Amino acid sequence: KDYRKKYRKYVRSRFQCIESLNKRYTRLRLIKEPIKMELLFDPDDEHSEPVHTVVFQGAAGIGKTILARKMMLDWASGTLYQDRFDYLFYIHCREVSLVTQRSLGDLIMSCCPDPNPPIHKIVRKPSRILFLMDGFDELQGAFDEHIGPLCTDWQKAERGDILLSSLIRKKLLPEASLLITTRPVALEKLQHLLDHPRHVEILGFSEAKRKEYFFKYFSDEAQARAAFSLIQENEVLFTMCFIPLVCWIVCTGLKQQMESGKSLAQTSKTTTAVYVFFLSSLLQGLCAHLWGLCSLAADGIWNQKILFEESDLRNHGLQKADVSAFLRMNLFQKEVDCEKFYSFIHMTFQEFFAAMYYLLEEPSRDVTVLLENYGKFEKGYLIFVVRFLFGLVNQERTSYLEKKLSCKISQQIRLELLKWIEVKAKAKKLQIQPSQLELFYCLYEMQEEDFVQRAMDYFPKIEINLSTRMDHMVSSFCIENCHRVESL
Numbered sequence: 001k002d003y004r005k006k007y008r009k010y011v012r013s014r015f016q017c018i019e020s021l022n023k024r025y026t027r028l029r030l031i032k033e034p035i036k037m038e039l040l041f042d043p044d045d046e047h048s049e050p051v052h053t054v055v056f057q058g059a060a061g062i063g064k065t066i067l068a069r070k071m072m073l074d075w076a077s078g079t080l081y082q083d084r085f086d087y088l089f090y091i092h093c094r095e096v097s098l099v100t101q102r103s104l105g106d107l108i109m110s111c112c113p114d115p116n117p118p119i120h121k122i123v124r125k126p127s128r129i130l131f132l133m134d135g136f137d138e139l140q141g142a143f144d145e146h147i148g149p150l151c152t153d154w155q156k157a158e159r160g161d162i163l164l165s166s167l168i169r170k171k172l173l174p175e176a177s178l179l180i181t182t183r184p185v186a187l188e189k190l191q192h193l194l195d196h197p198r199h200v201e202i203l204g205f206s207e208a209k210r211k212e213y214f215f216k217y218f219s220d221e222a223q224a225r226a227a228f229s230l231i232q233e234n235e236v237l238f239t240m241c242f243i244p245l246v247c248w249i250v251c252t253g254l255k256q257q258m259e260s261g262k263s264l265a266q267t268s269k270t271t272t273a274v275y276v277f278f279l280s281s282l283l284q285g286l287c288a289h290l291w292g293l294c295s296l297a298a299d300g301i302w303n304q305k306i307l308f309e310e311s312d313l314r315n316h317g318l319q320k321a322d323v324s325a326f327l328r329m330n331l332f333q334k335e336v337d338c339e340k341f342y343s344f345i346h347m348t349f350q351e352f353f354a355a356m357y358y359l360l361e362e363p364s365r366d367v368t369v370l371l372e373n374y375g376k377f378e379k380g381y382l383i384f385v386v387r388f389l390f391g392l393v394n395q396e397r398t399s400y401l402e403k404k405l406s407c408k409i410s411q412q413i414r415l416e417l418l419k420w421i422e423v424k425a426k427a428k429k430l431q432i433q434p435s436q437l438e439l440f441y442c443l444y445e446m447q448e449e450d451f452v453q454r455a456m457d458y459f460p461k462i463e464i465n466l467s468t469r470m471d472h473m474v475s476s477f478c479i480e481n482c483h484r485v486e487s488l
């Protein structure tokens with residue numbers, strides 16, 4: 001009762017996104033499978049029982065965390081679910097252990113400011129609680145669909161997997177609301193737990209909200225208009241900027257280009273090109289501690305560690321001066337509430353350095369065993385690890401950052417990637433790992449026509465489902481380089 005005031009105060013301070021949230025938060029396009037945030041839990045014209053599970057699916061960098069944090073902030077300010085929820089608990093999935101034994105009470109108390117919250121008072125009205133799980137796909141380790149028995153006592157300590165499974169399956173606090181944000185990759189794993197869910201999709205920035213971000217990022221009208229005009233000209237950057245992460249990456253590297261006397265230009269055509277242009281802007285140590293960065297990222301992906309302690313990065317070679325320089329470069333970030341944890345700015349950046357670990361000029365560097373774990377939850381699906389390998393393998397594409405890569409092993413990896421496409425396109429009997437459209441994103445990163453044309457011949461018939469202008473751009477490129485041997 002009185003604790004709700006103390007709790008909303010704590011939430012309002014923690015969720016001010018000072019890495020302001022209201023200052024740079026740009027409206028995200030959400031569509032049901034357009035939706036008004038307050039009406040998310042309201043039953044449609046047809047049914048009368050309110051919706052308890054709502055799932056937000058979004059691509060990497062689309063803003064699932066920014067949306068979840070903006071919801072925490074809005075609610076704590078009395079502008080969202082004021083009459084609906086007494087408590088909103090923020091479960092940040094990357095910090096959650098699926099093996100450590102904890103009860104639902106222990107988990108709820110973790111979200112509180114004080115060491116002794118009134119837990120029995122809080123769980124008195126379970127329907128007045130909204131558990132908000134940000135990043136389901138970021139649960140480190142294997143998520144088993146066969147685990148049990150399910151739990152019905154909020155005080156019984158259970159293993160993390162049994163605890164979240166019982167919470168998601170609506171066994172623990174059955175009338176409590178749930179908001180799960182996930183990448184569509186994990187939707188396979190999640191759909192089996194879900195109990196009557198409302199599915200919502202985060203489509204990112206509109207063309208209008210793209211311009212808005214550029215004018216919010218740059219506090220000088222001349223600079224904001226120059227950066228937006230650059231994107232309006234580049235078909236790839238204009239198309240890619242629907243992802244708010246691409247908006248930030250592009251704006252940040254364009255800001256560094258404005259500090260120097262360089263005329264605004266970005267001739268990037270692939271996601272690899274964008275990431276290498278961004279990382280090249282930071283090369284003003286990044287080039288000395290490259291092997292350490294890539295070994296940290298490969299270990300974090302293969303042994304499932306999103307958050308690294310000071311001891312972990314010290315083991316990989318990154319000393320106090322190196323972590324303090326990478327943090328300033330906006331490559332690393334301080335995370336896990338006020339605890340001394342570190343992580344790459346985005347999961348895509350960890351996958352970019354994991355992909356680079358396999359190509360570095362001299363974890364297991366065998367690309368065969370990496371491809372064997374592709375599309376599996378227990379390793380993070382390896383989507384950008386494989387995509388960035390296609391891009392970085394490109395020999396008719398170099399930079400100072402790419403010159404430190406072994407062209408001896410990138411030619412062996414290039415041939416192992418081509419055998420992979422051949423296996424995946426031919427045997428279409430598999431139940432999702434690289435879809436045909438996903439293989440097109442991989443070939444788009446490759447960009448070299450000898451490879452793209454050789455690989456496109458392995459596809460017997462083009463069977464794709466386009467949804468975005470990105471899907472059109474990528475698939476259009478692949479089909480252009482898909483000409484029969486006898487053709488014409």
Ligand SMILES: CCN1CCC[C@@H](Nc2ccc(-c3c(C)cc(C(F)(F)F)cc3O)nn2)C1
Pocket residue numbers: 059060061062184185243245246271274348383435437438441470
């Ligand atoms: C499930 C795997 N796959 C199946 C085929 C369709 C594909 N759809 C997308 C959409 C956007 C992005 C994406 C990109 C192109 C760049 C960035 C980055 F710039 F931020 F890196 C982030 C992204 O999420 N990827 N795939 C997903």
Ligand SMILES: Nc1ncnc2c1ncn2[C@@H]1O[C@H](COP(=O)(O)OP(=O)(O)O)[C@@H](O)[C@H]1O
Pocket residue numbers: 024025026027028058059060061062063064065066067135244245248346
């Ligand atoms: N609505 C938004 N407004 C402004 N910036 C955003 C927004 N959504 C995402 N971002 C940018 O994208 C970056 C990563 O987004 P995030 O929410 O972590 O993505 P996801 O959780 O889907 O992987 C943030 O650091 C931020 O700069």
